[PDB]
Symmetry: D3
Subunit: 101 residues, 6 copies
């Protein structure tokens, strides 16, 4: 009803490339974060931030990743970076209140 | 060879440019120094960003650094796969070049020729 | 704007008028370009036009799949929104409402 | 929030628009052009405010936006529409104080 | 590469197979996408396929005009290259030289 | 390389022979938006340079550098513009900024040598 078999296979491949191999899942989700930030996709950034938090990334790990995206992608990324840090703070508050992420 | 030479010459000039240009280049270096993320990981992140943004010289630079910091071909390829799926088939020409360059770096390693910048 | 702005807007309209390529084809091209460049308002515009010119959901989906593979999984949020807007258009159609 | 590197980068972003051989109005117009071709609404809004503060006329702004339009393609049109809407807002504020 | 790399390449081929849109049309769409995204090797690939599938120069130019207007004057160097390459393919066609990938 | 740049531009415009009316209109608009108005030509060409740099188009960068030099821009003015492009567009701009500086050096050497800079 929505899309084709090719669409479905592509979405599946997008999930698959973030599964752990020689690189662990936290590392791959941090890479997804970096790519999503330099390409300036807010929904993608939010998805990978959630995953990073779920996989036990620290705020400092996330910040150091975001800094690489900022330098590579330029000051044009700043509004997205700002939104990312704000969303991370919401996630940490949920954690402190015992809400499932 | 050339790649290395041209990088040095650029940093030599960045005499020319401004204080702001110098400051930028210094930050570009700084953000890959070790923190809670180790330098291998940061250099792999640089590789991913460089690849999705389709900058061949950037790709080359971060491939060198990833090899220097002990990343395996399998680690590199897992990172390049994320870049490929996220950035699309337009990434393919860059991936092809990345793999050619990695093979050259591995041949240098095989022969004891130090991978330097 | 200026005289230049008007001239540019006029060219943007003109390039989708049919020639050896028919209008459905050109509007589907507009949709593909809009999707890989991730412009929601552009996507919406060309979706309306594709529907107006008789494109089927399948033709639209086949085009969106090219944009997805060429442009990468970074386009997924826009593709999702494209399909949602198409469904809205189809529902308008079934309710006897005009796609203008 | 962030690191010392983040702070330094934000500082550098401010610094590059300080006057030199190019005046601040010119530099802010360049930021406007860059922000428009790159399709960043928050960036466009920022540099519009600065352009207005530095005395740029609507005609100056329009001539800059035309460059961004041609360079960046018709894909920039939604952003150009929003820029102009926001410029009109700033001019109304100017009229009213 | 990996199984995921292989799957991605398989999907890249698959999305151009005939459906309700014919292959000529799909390859022209590939051309437009490749051009606005300024990938020269991708443009060359799709030009070869367009030519192989019987597109005319006028059809190709109408497509390139969409990409030019949508993607901007930054596209011009790529359009120049595309037209040079197309002229090479037409010379091959004139000369009865098989065009194959 | 400057000479190569000039001849390829020449041949393309000659070819835009095969352009549709739409292609020709677009090219004319591309020239028109840099003609002076309330903003002067040096300013508009410096904007073209900034836009071309953050979008990472080498031939476009080269074209606007020629025009900036022709219109009497200084290296300092050009570098202040390129710094905006670098910060905004990120370190992926660096390879292009390197090429830009190299090309500017070639133009300055032509100028020193009394060699006409033309397109």
């Amino acid at each position: 009803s929505r899309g084709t078999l090719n669409t479905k296979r592509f979405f599946n491949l997008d999930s698959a490339v973030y599964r752990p191999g020689k690189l662990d899942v936290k590392t791959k989700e941090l890479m997804g974060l970096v790519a999503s930030t330099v390409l300036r996709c807010d929904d993608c950034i939010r998805y990978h931030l959630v995953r990073c938090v779920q996989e036990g990334a620290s705020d400092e790990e996330i910040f150091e990743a975001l800094d690489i995206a900022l330098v590579v992608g330029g000051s044009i990324v700043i509004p997205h970076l700002r939104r990312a840090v704000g969303f991370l703070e919401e996630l940490r508050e949920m954690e402190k209140n015992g809400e499932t992420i």
